[PDB]
Write a protein that binds this ligand. Structure first.
Ligand code: A3P
Ligand code: A3P
Ligand code: MG
Ligand code: MG
Ligand code: MG
Ligand code: MG
Lengths: 221, 221
């Protein structure tokens, strides 16, 4: 699994690389995609099939996963998690809220960013630091995935906007040259609605099978 | 009502000015606010009481209003609408999809914008044009409201991001000095999922009772 390369043992994950046949929303989810085009319906249903497989590994039965503030997923009591879908990937990660405070994941095609996007998503200091990272890796795309995972882990604990310029992400590469760690240093007020302040979020990144994947798992102390 | 000052006929509106006692979510809505702090629970529940009053006026029984892509409200079959909540205001507008293509509304306290917001939401040309507008009005705040109503009317028809810089808003002021019209000229690809391109959205604005309110109601062709 691509997500096993960026996750700890305390969470369950499930992923697919396509839209498997015969998948349906649960009845409670139907209104969220009643008006959605085929591509949106597919990713929504497929990623929630993945979520319910991962929930099953936690000993949680099939439940609907609705959407709340700014699109955040709505987990059953005692569960936290994150969802992501891009071209060739749907993935879900869940953990017990007794062991895990927040999860944020992202997956993107491992390709150069469209012209203009890098400058829009970076601090000057990030552009400099990227230029000195090693490997034939699309560091622009990897940075984008890390910013996205950071927002997904941050938002359920704060319900505040985190802009691209509001986190400074630094990367470390493990011996493989294709995976490692990142740290997101939060540059804005770090007060959380629950648990300790979010001054910094540590995560993992991996580039494998034409995808960049990032995950942050914030643990309950 | 404050919303009646910015609306045509064939839409229903409802509003209140606080969070009254004696309100509950519908049971299908409970998951959306199950982890929410009181201020968020209260605004969510009150604005949906408003939405159900406006639906009742239109002839639609009380239904849950869930959230979909990027937080967009999920309306019942044959209905479009918009919701807003700020300090001292909750309001809802709904129409039949047979009369109305889309609806966007916004309400803000009529106060100067907080630091840095005006520059984040404007083109250079807009900052120039706003300096030219007449009256002791917070034109920075009214522009923010018109950009918010624009995005809410646009998003359901496109499912594409509209940045604050992707819409050029121009205002008219009526002889009252506290109401008028605006036009939002769209600067990105205007193609809709159905019907004619969204090249420009026309709306109304009003300042009354310490609030700025904006509404766009788009015609069903
Ligand atoms: N504000 C937010 N906080 C955390 N997760 C969010 C979020 N808004 C959206 N998400 C999650 O991000 C998912 C999409 O991830 P990505 O954009 O990387 O493919 C959404 O999938 P769904 O819309 O299917 O629920 C949703 O579950
Ligand atoms: N992408 C989107 N498109 C249209 N309406 C949206 C939207 N995201 C959020 N909204 C609506 O805007 C409301 C909030 O408006 P405002 O920010 O002006 O107070 C939300 O209220 P709820 O979160 O209570 O559903 C939701 O109904
Ligand atoms: Mg996706
Ligand atoms: Mg993503
Ligand atoms: Mg609000
Ligand atoms: Mg608003």
């Amino acid at each position: 699994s691509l997500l096993s390369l960026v996750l700890p043992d305390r969470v369950a994950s499930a992923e697919v690389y396509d839209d498997p046949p015969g998948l349906s929303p649960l009845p409670e989810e139907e209104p969220l995609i009643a008006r959605s085009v085929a591509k949106r319906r597919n990713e929504f249903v497929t990623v929630r099939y993945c979520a319910r497989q991962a929930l099953g590994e936690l000993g949680v039965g099939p439940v609907p996963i609705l959407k709340g503030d700014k699109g955040e997923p709505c987990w059953p009591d005692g569960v936290v998690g994150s969802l992501t879908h891009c071209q060739g990937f749907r993935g879900a990660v869940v953990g017990r809220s007794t062991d895990v405070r927040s999860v944020g994941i992202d997956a993107e095609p491992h390709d150069v960013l469209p012209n203009g996007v890098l400058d829009a998503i970076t601090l000057p200091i990030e552009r400099a630091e990227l230029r000195g990272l090693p490997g034939d890796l699309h560091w622009d795309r990897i940075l984008f995935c890390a910013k996205e995972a950071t927002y997904k882990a941050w938002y359920p604990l704060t319900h505040r906007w985190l802009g691209f310029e509001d986190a400074h992400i630094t990367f470390e590469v493990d011996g493989s040259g294709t995976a490692g760690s990142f740290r997101s240093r939060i540059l804005i007020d770090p007060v959380a609605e629950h648990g300790p302040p979010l001054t910094a979020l540590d995560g993992r990144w991996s580039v494998r099978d034409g995808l960049a994947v990032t995950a942050i798992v914030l643990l309950e102390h």
